[PDB]
Design an enzyme around this catalytic site. Structure first.
Site, mmCIF file in Angstrom:
data_model
loop_
_atom_site.group_PDB
_atom_site.id
_atom_site.type_symbol
_atom_site.label_atom_id
_atom_site.label_comp_id
_atom_site.label_asym_id
_atom_site.label_seq_id
_atom_site.Cartn_x
_atom_site.Cartn_y
_atom_site.Cartn_z
ATOM 1 N N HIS A 224 0.750 -1.457 -0.009
ATOM 2 C CA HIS A 224 0.048 0.112 0.077
ATOM 3 C C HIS A 224 0.966 1.354 0.129
ATOM 4 O O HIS A 224 0.331 2.229 -0.225
ATOM 5 C CB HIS A 224 -0.908 0.046 1.014
ATOM 6 C CG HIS A 224 -0.468 0.532 2.330
ATOM 7 N ND1 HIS A 224 -0.015 -0.324 3.400
ATOM 8 C CD2 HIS A 224 -0.202 1.636 3.139
ATOM 9 C CE1 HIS A 224 0.451 0.378 4.289
ATOM 10 N NE2 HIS A 224 0.400 1.540 4.160
ATOM 11 N N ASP B 94 -0.246 -7.835 2.112
ATOM 12 C CA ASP B 94 0.383 -6.364 2.160
ATOM 13 C C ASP B 94 1.685 -6.357 2.113
ATOM 14 O O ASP B 94 2.534 -6.012 3.169
ATOM 15 C CB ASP B 94 -0.266 -5.192 3.222
ATOM 16 C CG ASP B 94 -0.068 -3.785 2.782
ATOM 17 O OD1 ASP B 94 0.427 -3.384 1.907
ATOM 18 O OD2 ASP B 94 -0.049 -3.280 4.105
ATOM 19 N N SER C 296 4.433 2.970 7.727
ATOM 20 C CA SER C 296 4.090 2.109 6.900
ATOM 21 C C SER C 296 5.200 1.479 6.074
ATOM 22 O O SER C 296 5.749 2.383 5.715
ATOM 23 C CB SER C 296 2.898 2.591 5.938
ATOM 24 O OG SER C 296 1.640 2.216 6.510
#
EC number: 3.4.21.5
Lengths: 6, 10, 252, 30
Positions: C43, C99, C199
């Site tokens: 992502h 992910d 992230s």
């Protein structure tokens, strides 16, 4: 719901 | 914010 | 990182910054797994709900960093991306299942005191270490609060892996076996979480058997940052290692 | 080829120095 990315 | 990266270093 | 501390010098030599060229922006963390390969969250590169679709030329990877914003002359190394590889069953539509993404670098990065690859776990390592209560370590240059909100230097926090039913019961999102959650409970007193910009960074554990650091997770998602009764969700690296291995074996 | 030496930090494991919070991790492992 939908997952919220960091 | 971010200090410039020199062109020769990429 | 919320409620963490400043990293020590050379504490996380596999830490990578994904850096947007224009505007100049921290995009995400990532990790160095060999001299040519960087591991991150899918992502970070592809997220259609926010019109995120970064090509190779949009980004730089900065390896060996400590300061968030300074150009760390004689310390950091900056590499261009040769190719991005996103897991073909990455589920951006729902719950960020799988992910994970790989980035092949244009040229090999030279290792140093500040730059060194992390190990990827095998089945035995995963079985040994991925247990409720066992603590891993998350690092990044993401925000200090949900909302000084941004760190001067790389942040670190150690967080316990959480029991799977407790993870499920903290959220409405459908959890999968390709994720785990970590963080303290309200009654545990201690705090900490990843936040915006963390992230794609690594969740690592030090094997007590061979004294090596293994990347067990990738910072994926959560509901806010460091909220009581919420937990951070991490991509389960070992579960997706067959894909990692297949990409490297055919493209590396 | 970098597999052999993976996860061993030049400024810590390679010099047998410990970082200030790695013991917290070890202590959680049982």
């Amino acid at each position: 719901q939908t997952a919220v990315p960091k | 914010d971010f200090e410039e990266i020199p062109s020769d270093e990429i | 990182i919320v409620e963490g501390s400043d990293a020590e010098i050379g504490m996380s030599p596999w830490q990578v910054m994904l850096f947007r060229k224009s505007p100049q922006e921290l995009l995400c963390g990532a990790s160095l797994i060999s001299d040519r390969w960087v591991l991150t969250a899918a992502h970070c590169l592809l997220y259609p709900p926010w019109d995120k679709n970064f090509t190779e030329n949009d980004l730089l990877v900065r390896i060996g960093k400590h300061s968030r914003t300074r150009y760390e002359r004689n310390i950091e190394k900056i590499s261009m991306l040769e190719k991005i590889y996103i897991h073909p069953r990455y589920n951006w539509r729902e719950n960020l299942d799988r992910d994970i993404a790989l980035m092949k670098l244009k040229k090999p990065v030279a290792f140093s005191d500040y730059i060194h690859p992390v190990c990827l776990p095998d089945r035995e390592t995963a079985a040994s270490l991925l247990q409720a209560g066992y603590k891993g370590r998350v690092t990044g240059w993401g925000n200090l609060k949900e909302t000084k909100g941004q760190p001067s230097v790389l942040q670190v926090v150690n967080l316990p892996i959480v029991e799977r039913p407790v993870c499920k019961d903290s959220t409405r999102i459908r959890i999968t076996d390709n994720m785990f959650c970590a963080g303290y409970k309200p009654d545990e007193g201690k705090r900490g979480d990843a936040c915006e910009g963390d992230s794609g960074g690594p969740f690592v554990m030090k094997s007590p058997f061979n004294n090596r650091w293994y990347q067990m997770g990738i910072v994926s998602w959560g509901e806010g940052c460091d909220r009581d009764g919420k937990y951070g969700f991490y991509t389960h690296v070992f579960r997706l290692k067959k894909w990692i291995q297949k990409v490297i074996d055919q493209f590396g | 080829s970098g597999e052999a030496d993976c996860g061993l930090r030049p400024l810590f494991e390679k010099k047998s120095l410990e970082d200030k919070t790695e013991r917290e991790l070890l202590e959680s492992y049982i």
